[PDB]
Each structure stands twice: as C-alpha cells, then as structure tokens.
Symmetry: D2
C-alpha cells in the first residue's frame, strides 16, 4: 500500500468489466445522438463508431488492454478508443457523467440478465410439466407431508405442478421488476440535466428503454431496482431450496423415493448403495449468499443522502453474484430433474400406509350428516381395533363397516385401497388423477408443450 | 415446563389481528357449505346469527379470548359453538387450518396493501403541492454528490425525485397485491378434499381473483408474504433517504429547513438546537423491516413441502413491518407540509462563488471545444479568480472573452444563479422551464385542477 | 390524530417497561451517590429512597400508574416519585441525562439476562450429559450421517456430547460478551461529563460494574455490546436449530429413530402412527427472527454520527425478543430431551447396514501396508461380489478374506460385525465406547454431576 | 451440463487462498504418520521434499492448479504423487477432506485475526497520536445529539471514543481467535479412526491449544466462522460511524476538516469540492460484511449433523469480509494523520452564543437549586437575550445576580468557551484535564 491500496480499494474494473457490452452499446447510441444533435461531426462519429468495433473485437479476442490504473470499464473503453482514433475519442463522453452512465449500464445489464433468467425458468417449468406427465401414466403416488409427517396421499404429478405454480410466480416478479426498471437514466448527467442540446428520448428508444427517466436526481441516485431484482432472486432460490431439500430427503435410504443422476452426485467405492447429492446441497445452501446480497445493498442505501455517492458502487458485486447463482441453479435443476429415477412401489407403500386412507372414511360420514368431529372418533376406534387385531384397513368388509356405523354403504369400500381411494380428492386443485390431469393440460398449453 | 410449551406454540397473541378476515371467510365458507348441501338453511341462519354476536362481542371487548385454544381460528369456533350449539361444530367442515390460515393472511395483506396505497397516494400529493409552493417565488439549493456541493438544484426538482421513487413503490405494492390475490381456501390440508366443496364460490365471494390451482402450493407458499416485506423494505429505504436528508438540512451547519414543532423536540435554554426525533425514528426503522425480510427468508429456506409449523413465524414480522411503513407514511404526510425552508440561506449555498463555472465549460464544449479541454480552460480561469480573490459573477465580457475567443456575450448570463438555473433544461433537468412540465404532469396523475 | 400518532410512534414505554427494575436499582445507587457527594441531604436521600421502595411495590402489585403520556419508564418512575415524596423527588435526576441512564439500564438488564441464559445453558448441558450416559449402556448406536447419507456407525452418547461441545462454546460467547459490556456509562451525562462533583466510580462499583467507562462519548453512543450479545443468541439458536432438525427428522416414519414426548407434540383423531413435533419445528424456525434482529440493529448503527441519537431507541425491542426466544428455547429443550424414546433396534439396524462396516475393513489393509487407495478397490470388489452372492458383510469367512487378500488375518473378523466393530475408532474424540466413556466422565466432572 | 455442474461444485477458485495452511497441515500430518508408524522414514523424507517443491511452484506461478480436481486439497495431493511417486498417495492416510478443510479454515483465520489485531493496534496507535497532537493548541468542536450542537467537546476526546471502540473490537476478535484454536484434524470423516493416529501431536505443531473433543462437532462446526464474521461486522460498523462523521465534517457546511488529497477526488472547476471517496466506500462496505454474516447463518440453520456440502459456502464470505475489514483498517491509519482540522471554524461553531447556558443551570442546581428549576431559570435569561439581540459572553455579573441571587462571581468563567471548557472534569469527561489523563493511560496501553 497505501496509495496503491487506495487505488485498488477504489477500482471497480475487477467486476464492472462484466458490463463492457452494455457500455459499448450505450457508447454507440450516445455517440450517434451527439451527432444527430449537432455536437459531433459526421467525420467524428464515423471514427468513434469505427473505433468502437475494434474495441469489441479486441475484447472478444482477449486483446483489449484492460488497465486497472484506469479505474473502471468506462474510462477503459474510452482511453482505448482515443488510442485507436486520436482526437475523436475524446468527444464520446460529451454531455455525460459516469453517474448517468453507470445507472444506464446496470439497468441495461439487468434487463438482459432477467431475460436470460426468464428463459431459464421457462425451460424449468417445461421439465416440470413434462415430468408430471411422465409419472401420471403409470400412476405414481407418494405421501404428502405436514410437520414432515405423512398425511393424505399425493401424486408426483400434483407435486411437480406445485413447483410449477411457484416458479411461475417467480417469473412474474422478475418480469414486473424488469418492466419497472426499464427507464433510462442516460441524460441526467451528474444529477441535474444539462444545457447541452441532448435528446434523451432518442437514447431511450435505441437502447430498449420504454422511455427516459423523468427526474435527473432520482435517475442518478436510484438503486431500488437493484434491490427489487435481488429480492426476486432471493425468493426464487428459496423456492429452489425447498425442492433441493425434498429431493435430498427422498434421496435417503430412509425414504428411498428417488435416485439422483450420477452426473450430479458422488458415490463411494468400498460402499454399495451410497450416493451424495452435492449439487442439490449447494443449491439449497446458496440461498444464503443471495439473501446476503439483498441485506448488503439495503444497508448500503439506508440513510444515504441524495444523488450520486461512491457507496453506490457497492451495488454491482452483489448482483453479479446473485444472478450467477440463480442463473446456474436453474440450469442444473433442469438438467437433473428428468434424470431422476423414482422408485414407484416404495412410494406407493409409503403413501397408502396401514390406515392413512381412514381420513377418507371420516369425511364420508361427515358428508352424510355425521358431525365431522363426531365422525373422527367413531372412525378412530375402528382403526384402533384394527391395530388390536393386527389387520390393515384394506381388509375391512362392508358388513364389518356396516356394524361399525349405519351410514356406511357399498360405496365406502372403494375408499380402503389406495388404488381407488386417490380418485377421491377431485376438487379444483386436488391430487385426484382427474383434477391433476386437468391442470397438466393448462400447464401444457401455457408453456406450449402439448 | 408444561405451560411454557403452550405459550410458546400459542399464535393467538398476534393472530387476533386477522379476526375480521377470519370472521369474513367463515361467512363465505359457511354460505358455500349451504350452497353445496353440507349445511341446512336453518343451520346457516344460526351460524350467521352467532358470527354476528361474535363480531359484536369482539368489537365490544366482551368476546372471550382463550389462549388454551392456541389460535384465532379455534377461538372463534369455540365461541360460535358456545353460542349457536351443534351448528358450530359443522362450520369447519371440508376445511383445514392449513388452507384457512393461508386464506386469512393474504386476505389481510390485501386490505393492508390498500391502506398503504392510499397513504402513498396521499404522500405523493403533498410532495407535488410542496413542489408547486417552492416553485414560483423559486427555491434553489445545492445539488449534492459525495455530499459536496455539486450543481444548483431546484427544491421543486428535489420533491419530484421522491415523487418518482414513491411512485415506483406503489407499483411494487400493487403488483405484489395482484399476485397474492389467489384463494387457497378449499385446498384442505394439502391435497384437495372429497366433499363436494366449491372453491370458485368462495374465492369469488371473498374478493380473490380466482382459486389457486394447486393444493400443495396453496398451503405451503408464503412467497407473497416475502414479496410484500420486500416492497415495505424498499419503501422504508426510500423514506430513510428523505429523513436522513431532512435531519441534515436542519442542522445549524446546513440551516436549510426548519422542522415543525409538532414533530421535534428542543430545550428552553438553547433557542436553536431542534431535535428531529420523528425523522430519526423513521430512518432507524428501516432496520426492522430489513430484519423482518431476513427473518422470514430464513424461516422458509429448505422447508420440505406442505404445511409445517414453521410457517407460523410469518405473521409477527409482517404485522410489524406493515405497522412501521404505514405509521411512517402518515407522519411524513403530516410533517412535510409544515417545513420552513430558508430561501436565502439555500440560495447562497447553491451559488458558492464558482459552482457555475461548470456551465462555462459546457458552453465552450457546445461551441466546439473537445470538453476535457474546455474543462482545463475554465479551470485555469477559475484558479486565476481565486488568486485575485474574485467571485465568478464579477467577471466581465471582455476579460472572459479574453480568456478564450469562443466566449461571447451570450455566455455572460451564465455567471449568475438568477439566470443560470434556466440552463439545464434537458428532459428531467432542474431548469424551471422543465421542472414545470414534470410538475403539471405530476399534478394530473394525482389531482390538480 | 397527527399529534396523537407522533406521540405514539415515539413512545418507548411499551417496551422499556421491562427495565423498570434496572431503572429502579439505578435510581437508588445514583441517589445514594448524589447524597454522598452533597447534592442531596440525608432528609432528601431517605425521602427519595423510600419513594422508590413504594414504587417497586406499586409495580409488583399491578397498581403502578403506568402512564404513556410520560413517554418512557424513566419519567414514568420519576413522575411517580414526585407524587409520592414530593419536592425531593425532582432532584433524583440531577447530573444525569436520559442518555447515560437508558444505556446504563440496558447494559444492566442484559447482564442479568445473560446469567439466566447461562443457567439455562448450563442446565441444558447437564441434561445432554444425563442422556448420553443413559444411552451408553445399554449401548445405543445409530448411523453417523454425511450428506444426510449413512456414513459410519456412531453412538447416541457421541451425538449428545457433540451438542455438549456446541452449547459449551455458546455460553462462553455469552460470558465474554457480558464481561465486556460490564463497564458503567452512568455519569457520562448526555456526552462529556459534568461539572457536578459526581462519583462515577461509586455508582460503577455499587451497580456491579467492574468499572466505569473511560469515555463519555463512547459511553452514550455505543450499542456494540447489544450487537455482540445478539450474535451470541444467533449462533445459539442456530446450534439448537440443528438439533431440532435432526429430531424432527429422526422422528419421522421413515427414520423411526426416536419418538417425541406428547407434552411437546400433536396428533390426529383418526390416526395414531402420526405425531407432530410442533415445538421442535417452532424452535428451528425461530432461529430466523434472532438473525433478523441482529440485522435490524446492525443496520440502525451503520453510518450513525456520534453521541446519542433517537435512532438508539430501536435497540430494546430486538434484544427483548431474541433473548426471550433463546430463553424459552433453552427451557423447552431441556424439558423435552429427557422424555423422548430412542428406538434401540431400529437405530442399530440402520447403523450396521449391509456393508457399511466394510470401510473399517479397508483401513485394516491400509494400516497393514496397502496404499489407502488400492485397498478400496479390493474391499470394493469384495462388497460388489457380496451384493451379487446376495450376502451381508456379516458372512465373510476368515477363509474368503485371506483369499481376497493375504494381508487379512484372524484379527480382522471382529470388523465384520457392529457389536465388535464400534470399538474400532478409539482415537481421541472418536465413537468407540472406550473413548466416549472417557469424554462422558470428563464432561460430568465439568458440569458437576 | 457436465461442465456447469463441475464448475458449480468446484471450490478451487477461492479455497486455493488457503494453500499455505494446507501445505503446513500436510507436513504435520506426515510428520505424525511417520511417528505413529504409518510411513517409513524414506517415505516422509520424500513427501516433505515434495511439499517444498510445491511451495516453490505455487509461489512462482508454475504450480498447476486444476479445476477438475475440485479443491486445493486434491490439487496439492495430485501434484505430490506426480512429483514424488508412490509415497505421495499415503499422505492422506487416516484423514478425510472433512477434518482437513475444517482444520485449514481454522489455520487461516488465526493468522488472519492476528493480522487484524496488528492493524487495530496500528490504528488505535495513530488515534492516540492524533488526540495528543490536537490537545497542544487545543481543539474544540461541538458534541452532537440528534446531529444538533450539544455541549462543546475536545477533539482529543472525540478520538478517544473511537479508541475505546476499536479496543473492544480487538477484544471480540481476540476472544474469537482462541475459542477457535482447537484442532479438528483427526476427527476424520465424522468419527475417529482405528488407525494409531496421534491427535495431540498434530495440534501442537499446528499452533493449536489442543484437539477438539468430539469428532462429530469438529467436522460439522462453523460457529467459529459465524463468530469471526460477527466481530468483523461490528468492527466495520465502528469504522462506518467514524467514516460518516469525516464525510460530514468535511462538507462545505460543517467545514471542520479536510481529507488528504491521496484519499479524495476533486475538480479544478470547483476548487472547494473534495470528495471523500475512500471514506464513502469504507462506510458502504459495512453492508457486504453484514450480508456475509447473514448468508453463513442461513447456511447452517437446520443443517443436520456431520459434514454437508452446504458447509463449503463458508470460505467465500469470510475471505471477502476479512479483506474488507483488513483494507479498511489500513486506509484509515494512513488517512487520519493527513487530515487537517480547522481549529477555528470548529471552535467557533462549538460556542454558539448560548451553548454554555447549560453550564449556568448545572451551576444554580449545584448551588442548591433543584435542577428542574435551575434549567428553567436560565431559560428566561437566554430568552431575554435573544430578544435583546445579545450573546452570553456579554453577560455581566450584575445582570446575573439580577436574574438569580445564587449567581456568584465564580460563575463568570462559564460564559466563554475559553474558560468554561474546563467544567466537565469528571472521569471520562471532555474537560482537558480529564482527557489529558485518559490520553496518558492510552499512550501507556500502547506506546508513550
Ligand atoms: N464522481 C463520480 N460521479 N463518480 C462516478 C463513478 C461511478 C462508479 N464508476 C460506479 O461504477 O459506481
Ligand atoms: N397444524 C396445523 N395445521 N396448524 C395450523 C395453525 C397455523 C398457525 N395459526 C399459523 O398461522 O401458521
Ligand atoms: N433525547 C434523549 N436524550 N432521549 C433519551 C431517551 C432514549 C430512549 N428511551 C432510548 O431507549 O433510546
Ligand atoms: N464429501 C466430502 N467429504 N467433501 C469435502 C470437501 C469440502 C470442500 N472442499 C469445502 O471446502 O467445503
């Protein structure tokens, strides 16, 4: 250190280079505007634009002189342009400040990041719907949980479609975030506009923005959009952490419901049936670094006076990490889910326990007028005796069920064996194979699979 | 032990808040039961009759809150049956506590989010009126960057910077509101039910857009809660930037604005020292809302599907965040109109001897000087003026015109605030000309004429 | 009502009431000092002192005039002393500011609360030790997990002692936290001492502080201790959240390793094989709110200029909530552990699976002289072949072993069975009963039982 | 999607930061294998010469870091076998990556906290130097409350508040250090070993106070990491408080101090503007450390016992927090000394015409008057002054005796900051003698 420590400490080039494309795009657009407005001569724009192509080629070919000494990506492209085309380069940044320049780059970068994220979610929602179908044919059933205690029986199909609704809501948050941040700060200069004959509506259009921001001060100081995106990303990983958790569980000897693909696991030589879900674990675990990011940036913008402040530079690092995290997580789950091997039978024996369907017998009485609570006790004694006699609920006979309580009839019988009892919960959103299938149709039409 | 485990599990303490919501879904629920046969016309009449007594009882503070029943749901039920007899025991038919509490929370956040949208609207309105006020006589203060005087800014412009910020906060509250307005009732414990229950009837009667299409999701998802807490945070965070700034602009050092007596405290002795207590609390409260978001996020991470007891740790944080934001939206809309901004002091601060020198540079730049160069030029002139102990205003045509052949008469107007503020008239800038259209425009979006 | 809201919003009495004691105990020591220094006559000292004793009575009677219009516990207790003893009352708060007072109170309140916490933690580690010793003989074994996958057989006694280590370190964090905040801020008065000939070493000494804080500014402005305590609480619940996770898990119909006492669970009317671990769920989930609290407060002090600010008020609520969470959690846990039922057989069967002990078989060959790698291929080939022959590791004959590898010999036979194999990892800190019994003894002398 | 997963799973990109500690641990483990009897002498004195080559290679940039191997552990190993041959593959005898990585992190932090302690002692050392420097001609600025001028305070006093603060920070780090200095090496995968492994030997040679007493705990615990982050967070929080104030005192509005050119930015156009870039970053970076703490906590919540891949999310946030506090601690020690405090603008603002009207209340009340009224009496006075457009430095003993008989002549020195600044002489007070006292206490605590 210490002048070096200072330099290093202040520099953002180590991470802001990730936005070089957004800075290039803005450059072309902004340079073209300076021309249209009279601030730049055709000869000049021509050079700047010619020079900007060489820069991009140099970057894509790993020959661009990235210099930390130049502090950020902004001055880096600028310095380079001026080395490539003499004087013209030194006019590209006319009527502009880093302030409005940074916020434009960041927003520009997120819109793309989000569009790529929305793409990644469609793919995931597709594998989901696809997996739901693949396990609806030979009907797959397993236990639904509560307090991690088995409750009523559920279909893998209904289960996959559970994450379908979840991931669908995520896509809508990233969407609404995207739309809302799609304003342009370019043209706000340092904090108050300029006297320069600038044209912000032009720069807004050409750059994909719905319109230019209406307040130069907020244009330069706002980062609430970064926060909105980080939250979307937070909630998303939380949904993914839920699924990793369950797949990690059902992947245990204790459950034995599913085998994770070798590609996303590690085993053991000296050991037979052992396989560790490292990738599912890291996805589950990575939800924290994304939460960590949201907390970090919120603390940053708290009580932060108005307009640009260097504190604001602390905004990029968290996002790039959060995005990469959520990006790569969505990609893996879509490459892993269809490679899953579900052990049907072990799931079925688990779903239809010894007396789990008794819940159904209770509802049956209730529907006929027997106070549902009153019915819960009569039905309880029934099973209680079955245990005493060491018999399952599948063995009950109609006569035997009739002695228990008059309300029972021939129709109650099909409710003793999972095979037919599942068709019961056919309300909108139930697990019943009819309700689930009906829903698998929408999902299909929705993600365009059919 | 014993009772500790009871009080520890009891969610009654705070879920009483959703009493109106619960009460409401009960009616809609019972009515649906009747519509599907599960309830006798005479039973519904009794049920509805008892639920009214309950409403009247709670309202009167005469209703019996029993912690032994652990939550709000069973409290209303125990009481209903205690009043109506057997019919009570039928209310909770074809329904689980899982889908019941869920419907309640999001049913309550819809109303809360409405009260909050109403508050923000109100708040935006006063920023706009406050903007119109300091626009004509014309208030101007320094724009800040790194907290150092940057460029003269119009106070009207300043209010509008927050107008757009709070405007975006409404968008998030709205969009979040619209997303949770799906009904989870009729989803049972996790799978659907066998009873001939109708979810569209309830969803619809209860105000929801439509029924949620997945029973598992419906009773396990609390993501809507996290989307609201996220907005509350960003919302409070916006309020802290304003509070911080008011706490700063009202110091003896700045001396830009004076806080209303109603929201501050002082000491008979020192006549100045006016402690901005309300604003500090507003600022420091951004912390709780952040914490609430972290708390809940942590609660739901890696939570196996369906209902889990953990999901109950969802109502306390919200209630607090909702309460913090609401109270803050109210206080500022009450406080801001009463601010006394010191025009002259603000005006002098803005024109700090050479702040307008940046205007001369753009001038050269626009005529033709590169800009990095134009900068060097006005700086060599600025240094000369500080040396000779002279302010930028005391420069003369020929002298300025001497420093660079590009300077002409039309540049003169740039040496004095009085006429320079009319400079940055680009879309979104502080030039009065400009702030005036963004001000008309705003007025229309909230109520002008 | 605006004026109404403003007051409510700022009112701290709702939660600082909790500190009535410390504020009281303080009012005493401070007065005795005001006298001993001459600012009060004995006829005044006695007056105030007796007025305080009455207050302690009115409070612990439900008769104290808790009045919100008074804003906080400090003036509420004061306004009353002037109502009970008259004129001498209005001198109790001489040479003291609400600043160094509220801080002195909190540091005092936490110290007491930490001791409680330390008793609770100490109590919990005893119960961990009781259960360890109990399940040592008869010898309880279960799977040692890794990636939540069966790894190597472990002892319930070792499991318990693991947590023992964890809770041992937590208390330690609480120790050093307390002994660090145990410096007195009383007498910093607002910031900067006073001309009053106060004796702060007196008030420091008589209020349990090892000493009075060396800098008034720091004394009034700091809350880093509140933050340090909160962190300890966080790590504490996190350790607990892990044990809670394993009991919720181990008590599932899938693992079947343990059964939770009904006092802390819930069941079903038409089922019996179901038992819900609500309390353990809630204990795990509430680790979130303590974390959110640390976050709340850290965000309040970030970039906070010096001396007192209204921002600090935000310190009490978070602390009270986290401290109560960890407290009841340490209590419920203690009462719940000794009463659960560990399934001997199910656990043992899961520990010694089909070939899980084969790893000990490879360590053998490696110790003998086979590159730890190589040996894996060999034993792996052995298991692979046993999987096909449809045989368990517990069937290999000395003959077959010597056939697979010449290095195998007699003393390898006991590695084939669990009953004789859990004696293998006898290294310091291992699971071999020889080793655990040694740490259990050590652990007993440590917690005095 | 093979490469994606590999990259997602790899920890090399960041865990390579702990190579020094990994190399040190290998040497000890080997030294112990040989002792214990699991390595011939030929073998040890081969693995060692190979661990020296690896060091030279790593420090020279010729060492082959391979992402494919995943972590630093396998990387070094792969090179050992490559460099020495068969002996290499026995270094990992009776050891897991689990007890190995836990150890390495503990090794790293220890050296880290020690580095941080030295930086704290260096910062506190300059704070004390600054206090002294500004006592000489004597600097006074207003103490604040609600960011409002409260009671005049000594700049030296101001510096000592932060000295007490960092002092406690050093304490949390110091206690966090030794609480985590117990070797987990030897716990193996999650339980000990049947191997005649020596755990106290490793611990000693590795600087540890002793071996962790429970294999399970040792391999599964990250509370030490959580503890260190917390200390970092709280410490950084102390720096942001100071940073904020320097940013604030250097505004054109307060004008108390100027930030050294080497840590600021400016413009020839506006020669009165000077941006505290480094200080604003030091303030802002309070957030990422906060978030680091949050993330690691979220990782360990509800996490089953033993090792879990989740525990790999421990190094990245810690490396980022450490570098943050580290650099922040350095910049300030370099920045503070170059500051230029404006004795007058400061002094001036302190004594604001009525400021000391508080000293007259503590007068009347000490003289026997009930404070609640004394403070009320002086109010009348100041009030009558604002109306007469008069100060408080102008007040005359008579006007005083006029207002309230308890006023004596010994009270005139309470109107001019020149003299009144000596009133607050209680322990820890802002009065010069009080401060001068503490300042000598501090000099000794470090270096006179
Ligand atoms: N003094 C200024 N206006 N600086 C603007 C720099 C912004 C910085 N490069 C960032 O990426 O956040
Ligand atoms: N075991 C249950 N189904 N409990 C339902 C109670 C839910 C609790 N009142 C909550 O708000 O989360
Ligand atoms: N203006 C003041 N000095 N107020 C002191 C009151 C502090 C308040 N009771 C708190 O706990 O933070
Ligand atoms: N399956 C295992 N034992 N893996 C150990 C790898 C630990 C990983 N290198 C980390 O730093 O967290």
């Amino acid at each position: 250190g210490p002048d070096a420590l200072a330099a290093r400490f202040n520099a953002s080039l180590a991470f802001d280079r990730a936005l070089w494309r957004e800075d290039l795009w803005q450059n072309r657009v902004h340079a073209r505007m300076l021309h249209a407005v009279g601030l730049l001569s055709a000869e000049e724009l021509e050079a700047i634009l010619k020079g900007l192509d060489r820069i991009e080629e140099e970057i894509e070919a790993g020959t661009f002189p990235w210099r930390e000494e130049l502090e950020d990506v902004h001055m880096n492209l600028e310095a380079r342009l001026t080395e490539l085309v003499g004087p013209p380069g030194g006019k590209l940044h006319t009527a502009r400040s880093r302030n409005d320049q940074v916020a434009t780059d960041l927003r520009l970068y997120l819109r793309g990041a989000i569009d790529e994220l929305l793409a990644l979610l469609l793919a995931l929602r597709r594998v989901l719907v696809r997996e739901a179908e693949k396990h609806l044919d030979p009907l797959y059933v397993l236990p639904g949980y509560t307090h991690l205690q088995r409750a009523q029986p559920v279909l893998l199909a209904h289960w996959f479609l559970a994450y379908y609704e979840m991931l669908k809501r995520d896509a809508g948050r990233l969407e609404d975030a995207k739309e809302r941040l799609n304003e342009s700060p370019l043209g706000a200069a340092a904090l108050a506009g300029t006297g320069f004959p600038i044209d912000r509506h032009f720069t807004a259009r050409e750059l994909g923005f719905k319109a230019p921001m209406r307040n130069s001060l907020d244009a330069v100081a706002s980062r609430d959009f970064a926060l909105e995106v980080l939250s979307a990303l937070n909630i998303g990983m939380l949904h993914l952490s839920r699924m990793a958790e369950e797949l990690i569980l059902y992947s245990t000897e204790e459950f034995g419901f599913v085998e994770v693909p070798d590609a996303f696991a590690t085993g053991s030589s000296i050991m037979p049936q052992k396989k560790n879900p490292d990738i599912l674990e890291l996805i589950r675990a990575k939800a924290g670094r994304v939460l960590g990011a949201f907390v970090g940036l919120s603390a940053v913008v708290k009580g932060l006076p108005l307009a640009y402040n260097k504190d604001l530079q602390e905004d990029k690092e968290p996002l790039l990490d959060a995005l990469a995290t959520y990006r790569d997580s969505l990609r893996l789950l879509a490459a892993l889910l269809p490679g899953l091997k579900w052990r049907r039978e072990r799931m079925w024996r688990a779903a239809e326990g010894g007396y789990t369907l008794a819940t159904e017998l209770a509802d049956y009485l209730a529907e006929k007028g027997l106070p549902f609570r009153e019915a819960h006790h009569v039905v309880g004694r029934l099973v209680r005796r079955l245990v005493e006699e060491g018999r399952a609920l599948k063995d009950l006979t109609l006569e035997e069920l009739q002695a228990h309580h008059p309300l029972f009839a021939e129709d109650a019988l099909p409710l003793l064996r999972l095979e037919t009892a599942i068709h019961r919960r056919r309300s909108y959103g139930g697990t019943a194979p009819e309700a689930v299938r009906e829903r698998l149709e929408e999902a299909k039409k929705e993600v365009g699979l059919d």
